[PDB]
Amino acid sequence: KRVKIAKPDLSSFQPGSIIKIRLQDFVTYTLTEFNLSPSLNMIIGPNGSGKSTFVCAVCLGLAGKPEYIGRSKKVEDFIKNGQDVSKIEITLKNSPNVTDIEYIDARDETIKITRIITRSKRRSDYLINDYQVSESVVKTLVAQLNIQLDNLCQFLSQERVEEFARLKSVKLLVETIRSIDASLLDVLDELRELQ
Amino acid sequence: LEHTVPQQSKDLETIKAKLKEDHAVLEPKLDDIVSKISARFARLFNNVG
Numbered sequence: 001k002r003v004k005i006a007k008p009d010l011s012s013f014q015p016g017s018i019i020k021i022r023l024q025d026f027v028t029y030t031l032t033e034f035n036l037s038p039s040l041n042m043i044i045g046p047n048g049s050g051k052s053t054f055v056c057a058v059c060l061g062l063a064g065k066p067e068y069i070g071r072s073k074k075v076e077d078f079i080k081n082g083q084d085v086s087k088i089e090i091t092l093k094n095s096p097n098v099t100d101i102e103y104i105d106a107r108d109e110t111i112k113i114t115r116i117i118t119r120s121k122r123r124s125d126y127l128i129n130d131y132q133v134s135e136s137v138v139k140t141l142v143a144q145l146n147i148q149l150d151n152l153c154q155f156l157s158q159e160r161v162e163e164f165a166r167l168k169s170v171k172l173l174v175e176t177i178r179s180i181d182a183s184l185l186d187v188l189d190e191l192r193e194l195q
Numbered sequence: 196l197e198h199t200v201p202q203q204s205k206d207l208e209t210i211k212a213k214l215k216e217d218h219a220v221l222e223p224k225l226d227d228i229v230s231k232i233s234a235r236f237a238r239l240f241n242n243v244g
Contacts, residue, residue: 180228184221191214 008091010109013038015093016145018058024087025080027053053077057088059155061115063126063138068149070159078117086117098144100137103129113138153179 008019021034028050045051057078059069066073079086090113096106104111114127124135142149152160153175177185 176228180224188217188221191210191217194210195214 010091010093013093015095016147018090018092020091021054021058022087022089023054023057024089025083026050026057026078026086026088027080029054030080030083057086057115058090059149060117061088061090061113062147062149063113063135063142064149065124065135069155070152070157070163075117076119079119084118084120087114089114092145098141100140100144101128102133102137103131111141113141 010019013019017038018036021036023029023032023034026032032054034054043051043055056066056069056071060066060078066075078088092111092113094101094104094109094111098111101111112129114130116125116127126133126135126138128137148154152164156164
């Protein structure tokens with residue numbers, strides 16, 4: 001009979017994972033589809049062949065901006081040369097622990113985020129369930145998912161790799177105190193000054 | 196100064212007790228977190244030998 005692709009069932013995949021990614025109108029890849037394993041993802045390609053561009057587009061899709069990843073901002077690179085719009089779509093598991101969502105119920109297990117980049121228009125516009133929304137809603141959705149772009153632990157880039165290469169003990173203390181609540185250290189320091 | 200001595204002597208006990216209570220509340224949580232991160236670091240570096 002007709003060949004059928006594997007069902008992208010979000011229930012089987014762990015919450016917060018991505019099953020299928022659609023990349024439309026990008027450098028050397030006008031239409032591409034990508035699948036990610038639930039346990040770990042391995043991508044093999046030379047640098048500058050668009051694999052790094054694909055990863056950067058995926059990062060930009062989840063409320064990501066090039067200047068917020070500690071790297072140079074090149075919006076034009078993502079856009080296909082001669083195509084007006086470049087589209088990146090990310091599908092994620094949805095659980096009833098995140099607020100400020102559009103067209104998606106709490107019981108629904110799918111949160112689809114689409115980023116379109118065009119040269120003519122300069123604004124941050126994202127799509128939830130193919131409905132236009134401001135970047136603030138996606139950014140707060142990412143913040144409520146306990147995933148941070150600015151923090152070096154969740155996302156690591158070449159500049160972040162260089163920063164981590166020379167790391168002082170004070171930086172490790174700051175990271176440890178920021179991962180846990182930092183109020184306790186401040187209270188202990190105030191008590192030490194009182195002593 | 197004899198009247199001033201008890202007022203200062205009363206202090207350094209409540210302040211130390213509050214510092215000891217804060218240290219006693221804070222210490223086990225950081226200790227377990229440090230023990231867990233050290234155990235994860237050792238188990239990850241066991242592959243490195």
